[PDB]
Structure formats: C-alpha cells, structure tokens
C-alpha cells in the first residue's frame, strides 16, 4: 500500500549560514523561521516499499535521481536505523517553479523523513534525519514559528527543530515571495556557506556574539506577536548574512539591482506610514520575500505594482492567496520616489502561516501507481 | 601669490565610521595610496587680500559659500596656527576623493600664505577626515589617535613613493545612477546600526593595518593585493550590515570584481587587486608589466564604443591583444559602455609648490 505526504517550505527570519560540521551537518547558528501554507506551496511525495522491489529508487518532478548521492544515503540510513520490508521507492514533485525562490531542499527532505518516517511506523522525532538530508528540513517538521537549534553535542542528536509557536499563533501575517528578474548564475548555497565559513572574520563573529541574541529576541516578537520589532529584527538579519557574503573572499552576491529597489522601496513605504508596516527579506538569490500583516498587503502589493509594472496582464502576476487591487496615494506614490522598472518583478506568491507536513487519504494522489510512474 | 597642487588617495585599509563627528576622529586607523598628480591634482591658489571684503573661494570657477561649516573650521584651524584671504580651485577630476584631495590642498597652499610651521595633518583633518593621508607621498597611514582632544589622530608616511616603483593604478569609471548616499551620513549611519562594524573596528582594521604596512614594505603584491580586495569587500559588507543597509556597489563593479578572480584564477596567481571607495567606480591595483594585458581583458569585458577614441587616459599603454584562452577563462559576455573610461597612474608625491609665476589661478583679482 502506497502512502503519500506533503511537506511545506519555510523562510528563515533568523539565518542559517554556515556548517561546524560538514558531516552531521551542524550550524555554526541557530535559526528561527515561518513554515508558509501548503495551500500555496507544497511538496507531494509517495512512498511504497517492498516484493523484493527493483532496488532503492527515487524519482524527483521526473529525473529519476540515484541513490548514491551522499545524501539520500544519509537520510536512507537515519529513517532505517531509527526502525528499531526491505526495499523502497519514492517519487516525489512539487508546485514551486525552480525560478520561484529556494528551499526547494528543505521541503523536499523533509517530506521524505516524514513520509518515509511512517512508511516504517517511526513515531519518534525525525529531526536528524532530515537534517542529514537538508540542514534546514528539520524547520519544515512543524507548522508556523520553527527554530532549527544549533545542538550543543558533538554527536549532533541535539541539533533538532523545535516549534516556536503554532500556526494559528498569528493569523494576521503574511508572506509575499516576489519572484525578480535574474540571469546571474548564483553560486550554491552549500559550496557559499563554506567559502564563508572558512574566509569570513565577520561571519565568525555573527554567530558567536550576534545571533544567540537573535534568535532569544525573535521568538520574543513571535509570542507577543509585536510585528514592527519581529519586521526591523528581520531586515536587519537579512542584511547581515548578504553583508557575510560580502565579507567572503572571493565575495559571493546574491542581492541584484532589483532586490535593492525593492528594498529601498519597502523602508520608503514604512517611513511614509511613519511605522514599520513591511519588511523584507533574502536567501540565496535576488528574490524578495515580503512579511506584512494582512490589512497591509494590498497597499504594498499596489506599490510593488507601481515601481514593477508587469506590462499588461494581471494574470499569473499574482498567485496564491487573493489579493484584492489597491489604488496608491499621491503622496505614498511620491515617497516611494522610484522610477518604475517594467518586468523587475515576474510575479508574486501571496501566501500566509501553515501547518507542519500532511499525510493524504486519497489513492487518486498517490504519485506511484500500482508499481512506478506515473 | 601662492599655488599649490595636491593628490588624491585610495584607501586600502578603509576608513569608515568616526568616534567624534566635530573633531573628525576615526574609530580605525587606514591605509592608503597617493596617486601621482602627474594624472590626477588639485590646483589651489590663495592670496592674501591685503584688503578686501571677507573670504572669498571658487571651486572650478564657480564661487561657493566660504560659511560652509568644513572650510570655516578648517580656516579657523590654520588662521590659529599663525589674514582676510582670497582662494581658488580647480582639479581634473571629472564629475572619488576629490574632498580629501581638496583639503589637503587648501590646508598646504594657506599654511605657506601664512608661513605656518609644520604638520598640517590636524588643518586637513578637520577640513575632510581623509585629507591628512594626502600631505605624504608613498603610502600613507591615518592614525586614529588616543587622545580625545585628537591632537595626535594625524598622517605618518609608511613609505616613499619611491619604495615600490612597480606598483600601478587604475581607475575604472563606470556608468552608475543611483543617488550615492553621501560618505559623512553613511558612516555615521554605520556607527549607529553596524554591530559589524564594530567589531571591525576593535578587532580586525588592527591587525590589518599591521599587514598592509608588511606588504608594502616587503613588495609582496600578491598579498598586498589580497588584503586590499577582502578589505574593500568588508567595509562594503557592514555598509549592507548598516540600517537601513547601505549601496555602493552595482551590477558593472560586480562584473569587474569577478573579471578580477577570473584573470587571477587563469594565471594561478593573484596578479591584480580591487577596492571600492563609497561609490561603484573600481580602483585596480597591479604591477606594471600586467597592465596592458589587464586594460585589454576590461576592454574586451566592457567595450567602449567608437574605438575606445577617449577609453584609456593618464600614463599611455597600449592594450595587449588577448589569447582566446584568457578569454574563455574570463568566460564573460560583452558589456559594452559598462565602463567610461580607464584613468591610468601610480604611486606618486606629496603636495606641491608651483614655482611657475602663470599659474595662479587668480590674477590680483580672482578670475582666469
């Protein structure tokens, strides 16, 4: 019998940027992150096992990938000695576009413990064998508020996730992912980290000195649910591991010309409210993700409009959770002081605070038929 | 009666973010580089109005404010050390450091008006934080002080311009818009809201200015210029780690500094160095027999246009034609007008005394 899961994706507040440990992988940092809803976004994975199957094999959106990569095993290997029938097979797919954003991985891996979790009945807390697979999977285990702590043991068994605070904690946030406009090939988010770790005297400073502090404020502002302080902590955040990347040598960029338009718009639009009404944040590439409170997101949806007009359309400009057109104020429009930048922006995901991963009950979604695929 | 030229600088151990806006004192010691004016100068000349109607100054044959708060302290500063003056200026600099060029210049042409006896470190200082590293040739540091009443936050030479012969430098002028933020409010913006900056301040410009000092001394270029690029990039990052975060850097600098890594990776050697001031215009640093193989892979990264008629300006050279292997290791698209112009010079003197009796900048007047 073929089980299926769905796993979300989440955007970390508190940066993760950094391994003490390649192997286990362990953070220099702990992080705190918001699992988004899988209503919007999701990862679908099926997993059937056994009839002395035609060896370990996965599928991912179609590619049929091999077991050997270093980190399926990893994984593979957490789930089957946590099992204390044999053969396994997995086929998985997802609803963001690889042009969308990133953690793609996380998602990814975490609904491969889950589903994989229950394909052997393990009850117990699949932290680290999500971690093995993806350091940040283990955020995508819980739904709403998730930190991802550092662990104290070298054996990295204490390095696991832990929910801040659920979902319908905060009803009133939003998340806006806005998809920009990019051609620069990026470097990846493993190979940079390191580069980071192993060139950067700031980064090293961040997590010693500057990010336990954080993370002890962030989930400060998530309890009391204080947004202009959860916001400016945010940005300011942000900000830091880019300035990381700076400080690497080589220095890696992810920010583009677009994401600093946006950003520059985001403190021109709280400033004109005089309040911290939007912030703004980044991981690995030039797209901006966008917290805001629900009774902001249409004007500041109307703003990003107004400086990235999408030239003639408003189909698939906006997706997700419905957004419903917002006029811009003379004086607003005047405060943001930019030039529009027509395309800057391909589109928006307009999404909010979602549960941890999902088991499904219907044999219509089962993504391996009664042997592979489809 | 008195001209005067100055030079302009590049820091390579950045100065960024003051401990006293009204004395102007650094919360880090720096480093830099003073280019010969034989490319790039400051032209002042003073005259002591025997009498006439207040201080006048002309910037470029426009007459500014003489009330502005900089000039006025530095004029105090000097008129102390020691009546009634008339100053003029003009510089090639087209629309860098030009301020601290500046400075230096008034601080040096009046302190001979006034036959004032040495060290105008503090003048300058007080005029743009940077203008004293400009009252040395070589190389020059700005040290930071202990003193409060910052008497002794002054320059002190490294080493003469005549050390490293070698050594060359480019300034590539890129195509920009983006207002800047100006570099006095950014750092004091940094002051408040960097953590990073912090302990850039109190535990890495140290140690770094202690290198520098070392690789210059001892010629090492390819650690020279390691230095010179991971500093750039560090003052950069706790400009983006200031809040709201700070911008200097666009697509074009980007570009060059991966032109930069790419050049060097081909040639399994670090034979070029960058660093940015507050503004996207990138300072190359190389030797002298790289250069022209360098100016060709930047023309060849961002073509100029009309044959590059006006490209290349300062010490001639001729682009050497590159091999296709360096193009392909450089592995970048074309981007044509991404770069103005390429400024070439090297290390040069202190500032200078025109003994030549035409070339005041002002008759018994202040006009051409």
Not at 76 to 82: F, P, V, Y
Not at 239 to 266: E, G, K, M
Not at 295 to 314: K, M
Request: hydrophobic letters at 40%; proline letters at 6%; aromatic letters at 8%.
């Amino acid at each position: 019998a073929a089980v299926t899961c769905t796993a979300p994706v989440n955007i970390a507040v508190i940066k993760y940027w950094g391994k003490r440990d390649e192997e286990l992988v362990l953070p220099i940092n702990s992080s705190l992150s918001v699992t988004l809803h899988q209503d919007q976004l999701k990862t679908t994975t099926t997993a059937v096992i056994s009839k002395d199957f035609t060896e370990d094999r996965i599928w991912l959106n179609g590619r049929e990938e091999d077991v050997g990569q270093p980190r399926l095993q990893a994984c593979l290997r957490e789930i089957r000695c946590l099992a204390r029938s044999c053969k396994v097979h997995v086929a998985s797919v997802n609803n963001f576009p690889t042009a969308a954003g990133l953690a793609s991985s996380a998602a990814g891996y975490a609904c491969l413990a889950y589903t994989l979790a229950r394909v052997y009945g393990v009850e117990s807390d699949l932290s680290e064998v999500a971690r093995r697979g993806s350091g940040s999977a283990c955020r995508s285990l819980y739904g709403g508020f998730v930190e991802w702590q550092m662990g104290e043991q070298a054996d990295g068994k204490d390095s696991i996730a832990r929910q801040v605070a659920p979902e319908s904690h905060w009803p009133e946030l939003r998340v806006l992912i806005l998809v920009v406009s990019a051609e620069k090939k990026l470097t990846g988010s493993t190979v940079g980290m390191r580069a980071s770790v192993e060139t950067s005297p700031l980064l090293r400073f961040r997590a010693e000195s500057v990010v336990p502090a954080r993370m002890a404020e962030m989930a400060r502002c998530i309890r009391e649910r204080d947004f202009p302080s959860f916001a400016q902590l945010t940005m300011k955040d942000s900000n830091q591991f880019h300035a990381t990347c700076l400080d690497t040598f080589p220095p890696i960029s992810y920010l583009n010309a677009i994401s600093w338009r946006i950003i520059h718009l985001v403190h021109r639009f709280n400033a004109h409210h005089g309040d911290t009404k939007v912030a703004y944040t980044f991981d690995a590439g030039p797209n901006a993700v966008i917290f805001t409170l629900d009774d902001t997101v249409a004007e500041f949806v109307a703003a990003v409009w107004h400086g990235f007009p999408p030239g003639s359309n408003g189909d698939t400009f906006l997706k997700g959770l419905q957004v419903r057109p917002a006029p811009l104020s003379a004086e607003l429009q005047a405060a943001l002081a930019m030039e529009p930048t027509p395309g800057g922006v391909k589109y928006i995901i307009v999404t909010q605070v979602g549960p941890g991963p999902q088991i499904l009950d219907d044999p219509c979604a089962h993504l391996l038929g009664p042997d592979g695929l489809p």
